[PDB]
Design a protein around this ligand. Structure first.
Ligand SMILES: *[C@@H]1O[C@H](CO)[C@@H](O[C@@H]2O[C@H](CO)[C@@H](O)[C@H](O)[C@H]2NC(C)=O)[C@H](O)[C@H]1NC(C)=O
Ligand SMILES: *[C@@H]1O[C@H](CO)[C@@H](O[C@@H]2O[C@H](CO)[C@@H](O)[C@H](O)[C@H]2NC(C)=O)[C@H](O)[C@H]1NC(C)=O
Ligand SMILES: *[C@@H]1O[C@H](CO)[C@@H](O[C@@H]2O[C@H](CO)[C@@H](O)[C@H](O)[C@H]2NC(C)=O)[C@H](O)[C@H]1NC(C)=O
Ligand SMILES: *[C@@H]1O[C@H](CO)[C@@H](O[C@@H]2O[C@H](CO)[C@@H](O)[C@H](O)[C@H]2NC(C)=O)[C@H](O)[C@H]1NC(C)=O
Ligand SMILES: *[C@@H]1O[C@H](CO)[C@@H](O)[C@H](O)[C@H]1NC(C)=O
Ligand SMILES: *[C@@H]1O[C@H](CO)[C@@H](O)[C@H](O)[C@H]1NC(C)=O
Ligand SMILES: *[C@@H]1O[C@H](CO)[C@@H](O)[C@H](O)[C@H]1NC(C)=O
Ligand SMILES: *[C@@H]1O[C@H](CO)[C@@H](O)[C@H](O)[C@H]1NC(C)=O
Ligand SMILES: *[C@@H]1O[C@H](CO)[C@@H](O)[C@H](O)[C@H]1NC(C)=O
Ligand SMILES: *[C@@H]1O[C@H](CO)[C@@H](O)[C@H](O)[C@H]1NC(C)=O
Ligand SMILES: *[C@@H]1O[C@H](CO)[C@@H](O)[C@H](O)[C@H]1NC(C)=O
Ligand SMILES: *[C@@H]1O[C@H](CO)[C@@H](O)[C@H](O)[C@H]1NC(C)=O
Ligand SMILES: *[C@@H]1O[C@H](CO)[C@@H](O)[C@H](O)[C@H]1NC(C)=O
Ligand SMILES: *[C@@H]1O[C@H](CO)[C@@H](O)[C@H](O)[C@H]1NC(C)=O
Ligand SMILES: *[C@@H]1O[C@H](CO)[C@@H](O)[C@H](O)[C@H]1NC(C)=O
Ligand SMILES: *[C@@H]1O[C@H](CO)[C@@H](O)[C@H](O)[C@H]1NC(C)=O
Ligand SMILES: *[C@@H]1O[C@H](CO)[C@@H](O)[C@H](O)[C@H]1NC(C)=O
Ligand SMILES: *[C@@H]1O[C@H](CO)[C@@H](O)[C@H](O)[C@H]1NC(C)=O
Lengths: 203, 426, 418, 149, 50
């Protein structure tokens, strides 16, 4: 099943403050008005990087797994969010396809929409997110959002494939594009242009 | 005189220098990390990796004194590419990556950006714009047959790519697949290291890559931090970003991940102090065109000095806060001082009368030499005249004058011509 | 496919003439730029950013920084000359009379607002519609905007109270309804045509000035010529500033990175690329400012000419002082330029008439002293050629030259003798 | 100082040539600014590197001089076109254009030659001693309104 | 010969463009004026200078 992306999945591209300004950037972004896949879980290609989103009500989704084999044979990134923290491991070990070795890194830290972005750059994993209330039902809602960074992992893992750890959720794929970003007075991204979308956006 | 290359100067206003508020203090700030990085656990590690499967250690969250490593005379080379090795202690980096491996000593020549050689083709490749250092030394204590390198590959490997493929590489179509033969070869072979080998002898190599991201820094030189000053022109360094300016307390709504701020011109405009989360604004120390107002040197040696755009409160300390000399600071500490919209004017008397503009200054101000001293005044547009209009009165001329007014126009330049080949090549 | 205009086959024939019977006084706005924003750049602080290690390398290039400071200073002083030659054509600040007895004409929207700079009402609209520190600087003009508004008010008070006379000699007072009769007579319309229509003419003028306020208040699109001068200098400065961020082949565009990371012999090679790039970037700016200054000077010489000919006089140069037959114009100040309100006479409501080059009387040819012969279909008249006012044909309306037989298309009539 | 216009045509060209000449003495980052030093002291294979810096600087110096002279020649041409116009309208005629041939009303003018230029002596009428009078735009004689011819 | 002004506007545009095109053949000190020669006769670290 499907929905249109609208303009969602913009994020702060760098750790710099800028204000009352239009700034132009080239980066991996979700193309505006792209076709996000929607789901009622199956294992999916990761491509260049992922936009992942889900609608909150009952907290069924609790984590993610990323890799190429995932279930041992080589190292895989595991992410969990439960009880009081986010928890992360990069093990080459094996586990069941559902909730209840060589873990060369470890870290610890409908009514709503929760948005996430994943990509491989400098240290070679990144997470960004946004979390806000909703009253739209059974689709990705229109209107603007800008994801703040959460974390950078120095972990060097190689990923091509991923799976959700356990309803409604959405998936989309980033592509290298040029964007024009509207930073307001509080240095907050408040609008954007996807320069490749249409001849007016290119103008 | 020295600006015009002349001993005589005509009546006028002349630009001669750019004034600059000189800094009084120097500030150094870094994150106060007490840990020392484990370089002994690299250069004195027990046994190094091969060149085909080289080992990378990320090095982080510490002070580092690279000058100690640079003084290790065992290192037959310490060559650096985007930095000169004496400077390392001045800097701070967002990460460091150390790569460790062993080769025969003659191969060290290949461990550099953009070079040709089978190590650069098939084992270890620096990008052509690398930023870091290369370190190597002989190691006959390692002499032994374990030290593999790659002799063939189907294509050359990428910058910082690595390849643990232990395949029998089919140079032809033939799938020999588990045993070698014609056009199908195992591509890894190893140096036989013994003291009887000099370029055939075992050498240890370490390559240090530095990272210089926009994120807060992580590995710093030993340079100790100092206290902070506000509302004064200071030389400064934060995390190895450096300059001179007026620091202030500032209100800018940085989000918690943002480390520093930029203006519409993309110039650095604010920073967060590495030891305290306060945002500091950065403003340039004041500058502006010095111009000299003079009657002709045939008439007087008196002058006035205009500091264009500068506020009169910032000028007088130019005793040391600008390019001055003892007699020149009289045009800074003493005489008359007069603020104008064009800048601070020093050495001319403000006057409440108005006259025709003799020497122009700007924003309606002009200056002249009169009862004697240089004066400054608002220029006069000419005498006011209420014309005696009414709906039935006319005035008619009873007499006339012929006049003869000279008008001069340019018509031709001098007909210069230049032989470009004789001008350039003589 | 664009249309070049509506087509019109003119109703020509060898004995038909068309003569206007009414007119519209019309006010046409015209806008000219007069000066750039005065700028100066310290090439040492731009290229080298207060580094002495850089400044020493720049000495090896010899004269260039002196030569660029000279070029920009020559531009900057010329902007004060351009601003002076347009407005400062009047030697005394003429002051407006207290009572406004100008024969029905209402200048209150173009004369000063007494409650203030002392700008007119329209000069306030014109000021409202028109809209970093790396060693670049912006200098003030010599004349302040209040001095400019005193010059436009002095030019205007002279023009209203004394006609052209304040340019050619001492200003002579003249009543305004007499000045306009001289201006009507200047376009070949007889003096009585003003007085016999004075209330209508005053209403047409007052209403036309009102439509200028509505037009200027309603749309920004008229002042494009001035807003372009602002926009070009804004883009030129921003391009010159952003070229500091380019590498030109150096390891960084920030000069302190080079000086902090590298020892002298390496650092100097990197810095010399930034010097070479920034120096070429600065020559490219100064070259375009020299060419752009000549374009504004050509416009300032044109504005100075329109102020001598249209304001201090009444020009006969066709379509120079607005389209139509020119009567007068009024200057109004604007940021970086000037606005002229050209008052013009446009003829209207034409009628066809039969016509002839001459009239036969007693075997001899008569020709009109001024204007043309016409007939309404039954009677023959003479009229001034710009506004239909037929007269009975007489020996003092006319002059004589020889026998009938030479003239191609002459007609017989009585000529009356006073 | 009356001839300030013509004296500027001389001074601007003297400064242009002296700046162009002095730039021959600049190093531009070569070993020396005298070409015979390099050609004496150095082997060809090295001397090419030095000589190409001198060529690069001297060529940019000359391109800057020629570009400024193209712009300055256009300014002088604008003055020559204006002078040719004042000779046609003011000398060979009687201009009726306000302030074109000097202040006052134009009677005639006379040209005089001058170094690098031309001088016009514009002869003009100026009215000089007014008196006030009462005035009225028309005179009614018997009911008919009269106006002056 | 009467239309010499208009014929100069044509000739000056042609002479300018022919000279701008002919300048693609010049070396400016480089090893060749055919770009693919530099891209095929040298390794990157030399080729970028040329
Ligand atoms: C018109 O003005 C001229 C001056 O421009 C007057 O001529 C002068 O007359 C006095 C005697 O009244 C002589 O002393 C001067 O030498 C004359 N000057 C010249 C240049 O000849 C003239 O008198 C005035 N005429 C009237 C009627 O006012
Ligand atoms: C001259 O014209 C102006 C408008 O162009 C007239 O000003 C208006 O006057 C009336 C009252 O008489 C007010 O209701 C309006 O608000 C005024 N308009 C403005 C913009 O102030 C003025 O009355 C006329 N004066 C004469 C003497 O004719
Ligand atoms: C042409 O103009 C003349 C003068 O205006 C007209 O002649 C007058 O006509 C009226 C009646 O319409 C008579 O009362 C006058 O006595 C006539 N005057 C003369 C001088 O005879 C004439 O009617 C007009 N003809 C046309 C075709 O319009
Ligand atoms: C103007 O009137 C005269 C008479 O006053 C006309 O002259 C006569 O013309 C006829 C032919 O139309 C001849 O037969 C007569 O011999 C002429 N008489 C004289 C005294 O020459 C004349 O033709 C009229 N003009 C026009 C253009 O019709
Ligand atoms: C989304 O993809 C499906 C095919 O998998 C296609 O039929 C559908 O039209 C697409 N929708 C949009 C909005 O592009
Ligand atoms: C990542 O790993 C997969 C197999 O796990 C491999 O096919 C792919 O080529 C690897 N990518 C890189 C860049 O090494
Ligand atoms: C998160 O889940 C793990 C088991 O998957 C659990 O051990 C841990 O206690 C949870 N996190 C926190 C902060 O309690
Ligand atoms: C970790 O991986 C290595 C091979 O890479 C293997 O020898 C070792 O037994 C593994 N250890 C665990 C605990 O998985
Ligand atoms: C900036 O943020 C504050 C709250 O932190 C808010 O009051 C203010 O209105 C914001 N400014 C704008 C332009 O939205
Ligand atoms: C640095 O030292 C001061 C004083 O000991 C302390 O307040 C501060 O918290 C330290 N920095 C960090 C990163 O904790
Ligand atoms: C390695 O060990 C030697 C002593 O065997 C010591 O002098 C040297 O400083 C050590 N180097 C490092 C980087 O620890
Ligand atoms: C100086 O110049 C003035 C003219 O401005 C002249 O009158 C005076 O005699 C000169 N004096 C000297 C000493 O040159
Ligand atoms: C000059 O600086 C002082 C600093 O207190 C300020 O109050 C004053 O307004 C300034 N004046 C101008 C003209 O800049
Ligand atoms: C000049 O004007 C200032 C105020 O503008 C006043 O304080 C001063 O007394 C005046 N002096 C004279 C002589 O008018
Ligand atoms: C002339 O035109 C005006 C309107 O512009 C009109 O009011 C007037 O009546 C007309 N007069 C004649 C005689 O047609
Ligand atoms: C003159 O009259 C003809 C018809 O006889 C008509 O077509 C034409 O439009 C009229 N022209 C004018 C100027 O009124
Ligand atoms: C006007 O010209 C025509 C020829 O086109 C001719 O027949 C006619 O007689 C002429 N009329 C007059 C009054 O000359
Ligand atoms: C004209 O007469 C008035 C009468 O008040 C007087 O003010 C004015 O000065 C006189 N002007 C001349 C030129 O005589």
């Amino acid at each position: 099943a499907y929905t249109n992306s609208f303009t969602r999945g913009v994020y702060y591209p760098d750790k710099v403050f800028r204000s009352s300004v239009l700034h132009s950037t080239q980066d991996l972004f979700l193309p505006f008005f792209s076709n996000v896949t929607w789901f009622h879980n199956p294992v999916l290609p990761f491509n260049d990087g992922v936009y992942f989103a889900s609608t909150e009500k009952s907290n069924i989704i609790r984590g993610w797994i990323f890799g190429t084999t995932l279930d041992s044979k080589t190292q895989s990134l595991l992410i969990v969010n439960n009880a009081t923290n986010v928890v992360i491991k990069v093990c080459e070990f094996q586990f069941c396809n559902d909730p209840f070795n060589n873990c060369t890194f470890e870290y610890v830290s409908f009514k709503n929409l929760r948005e996430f972005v994943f990509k491989n750059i400098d240290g070679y994993f990144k997470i960004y997110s946004k979390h806000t209330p909703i009253n739209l039902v059974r689709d990705l809602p229109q209107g603007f959002s800008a994801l703040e960074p959460l974390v950078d992992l120095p972990i060097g893992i190689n990923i091509t494939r991923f799976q959700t750890l356990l309803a409604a959720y959405y998936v989309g794929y980033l592509q290298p594009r040029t964007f024009l970003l509207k930073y307001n007075e509080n240095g907050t991204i408040t609008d954007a242009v996807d320069c490749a979308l249409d001849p007016l956006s290119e103008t | 005189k020295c600006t015009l290359k002349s001993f005589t100067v005509e009546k006028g206003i002349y630009q001669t220098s750019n004034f600059r508020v000189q800094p009084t203090e120097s500030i150094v700030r870094f994150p106060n990390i007490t840990n020392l990085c484990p370089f002994g656990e690299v250069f004195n590690a027990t046994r190094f990796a091969s060149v085909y499967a080289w080992n990378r250690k990320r090095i982080s969250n510490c002070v580092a004194d690279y000058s100690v490593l640079y003084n290790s005379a065992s290192f037959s080379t310490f060559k650096c590419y985007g930095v000169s090795p004496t400077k390392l202690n001045d800097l701070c980096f967002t990460n460091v990556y150390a790569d460790s491996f062993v080769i025969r000593g003659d191969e060290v020549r290949q461990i550099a950006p953009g070079q040709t050689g089978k190590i650069a083709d098939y084992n270890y490749k620096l990008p052509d714009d690398f930023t870091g250092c290369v370190i190597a030394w002989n190691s006959n204590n390692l002499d032994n047959y374990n030290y593999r390198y790659r002799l063939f590959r189907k294509s050359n490997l990428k910058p910082f790519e690595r390849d643990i493929s232990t395949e029998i590489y089919q140079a032809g179509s033939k799938p020999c697949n588990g045993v070698e033969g014609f056009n199908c070869y195992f591509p890894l072979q190893s140096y036989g290291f013994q003291p009887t080998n000099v370029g055939y002898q075992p050498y240890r190599v370490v390559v240090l890559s530095f990272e210089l991201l926009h994120a807060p820094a992580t590995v710093c030189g030993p340079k100790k931090s100092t206290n902070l000053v506000k509302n004064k022109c200071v030389n400064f360094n934060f995390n190895g970003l450096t300059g001179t300016g007026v620091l202030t307390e500032s209100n800018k709504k940085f989000l918690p991940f943002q480390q520093f701020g930029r203006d519409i011109a993309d110039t650095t405009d604010a920073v967060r102090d590495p030891q305290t989360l306060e945002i500091l604004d950065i403003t340039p120390c004041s500058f502006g065109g010095v111009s000299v107002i003079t009657p002709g040197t045939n008439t007087s040696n008196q002058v006035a000095v205009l500091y264009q755009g500068v506020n009169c409160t910032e000028v007088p300390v130019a005793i040391h806060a600008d390019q001055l000399t003892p007699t020149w600071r009289v045009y800074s500490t003493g005489s008359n001082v007069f603020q104008t919209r064009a800048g601070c004017l020093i050495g001319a008397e403000h006057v409440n009368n108005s006259y025709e503009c003799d020497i122009p200054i700007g924003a309606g101000i002009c200056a002249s030499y009169q009862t004697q001293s240089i004066i400054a005044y608002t220029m006069s547009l000419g005498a006011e005249n209420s014309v005696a209009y009414s709906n039935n009165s006319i005035a008619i001329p009873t007499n006339f004058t012929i006049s003869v007014t000279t008008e001069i126009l340019p018509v031709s330049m001098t007909k210069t011509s230049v032989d470009c080949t004789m001008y350039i090549c003589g | 496919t664009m249309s070049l205009g509506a087509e019109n086959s003119v109703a020509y024939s060898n004995n038909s003439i068309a003569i206007p019977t009414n007119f519209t006084i019309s006010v046409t706005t015209e806008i000219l730029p007069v000066s750039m924003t005065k700028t100066s750049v310290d090439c040492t602080m731009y290229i080298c950013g207060d580094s002495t290690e850089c400044s020493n390398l720049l000495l090896q290039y010899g004269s260039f920084c002196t030569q660029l400071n000279r070029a920009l200073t020559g531009i900057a002083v010329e902007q004060d000359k351009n601003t002076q030659e347009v407005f400062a054509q009047v030697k005394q600040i003429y002051k407006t009379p207290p009572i406004k007895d100008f024969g029905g004409f209402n200048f209150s929207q173009i004369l000063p607002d007494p409650s203030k700079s002392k700008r007119s009402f329209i000069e306030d609209l014109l000021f409202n519609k028109v809209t970093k520190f790396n060693g670049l600087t912006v200098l003030p003009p010599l004349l302040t905007d209040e001095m400019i508004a005193q010059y436009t008010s002095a030019l205007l008070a002279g023009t209203i109270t004394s006609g052209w006379t304040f340019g050619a000699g001492a200003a002579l007072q003249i009543p305004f309804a007499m000045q306009m009769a001289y201006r009507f007579n200047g376009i070949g319309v007889t003096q009585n045509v003003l007085y016999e229509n004075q209330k209508l003419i005053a209403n047409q003028f007052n209403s036309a000035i009102g439509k200028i306020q509505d037009s200027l208040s309603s749309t920004a699109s008229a002042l494009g010529k001035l807003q372009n001068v602002v926009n070009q200098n804004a883009q030129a400065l921003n391009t010159l500033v952003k070229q500091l961020s380019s590498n030109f082949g150096a390891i960084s565009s920030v000069l302190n990175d080079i000086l902090s990371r590298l020892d002298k012999v390496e650092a100097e090679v990197q810095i010399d690329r930034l010097i070479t790039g920034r120096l070429q970037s600065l020559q490219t700016y100064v070259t375009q400012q020299l060419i752009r200054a000549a374009e504004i000077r050509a416009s300032a010489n044109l504005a100075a000419t329109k102020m001598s000919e249209c304001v201090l006089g009444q020009s006969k140069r066709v379509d120079f002082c607005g389209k139509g037959y020119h009567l007068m114009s009024f200057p109004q100040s604007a940021p970086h330029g000037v606005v002229f309100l050209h008052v013009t006479y446009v003829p209207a409501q034409e009628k066809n008439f039969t016509t002839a080059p001459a009239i036969c009387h007693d075997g001899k040819a008569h020709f009109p002293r001024e204007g043309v012969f016409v007939s309404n279909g039954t009677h023959w008249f003479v009229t001034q050629r710009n506004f239909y006012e037929p007269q009975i044909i007489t020996t003092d309306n006319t002059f004589v030259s020889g026998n009938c037989d030479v003239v191609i298309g002459i007609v017989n009539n009585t000529v009356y003798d006073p």
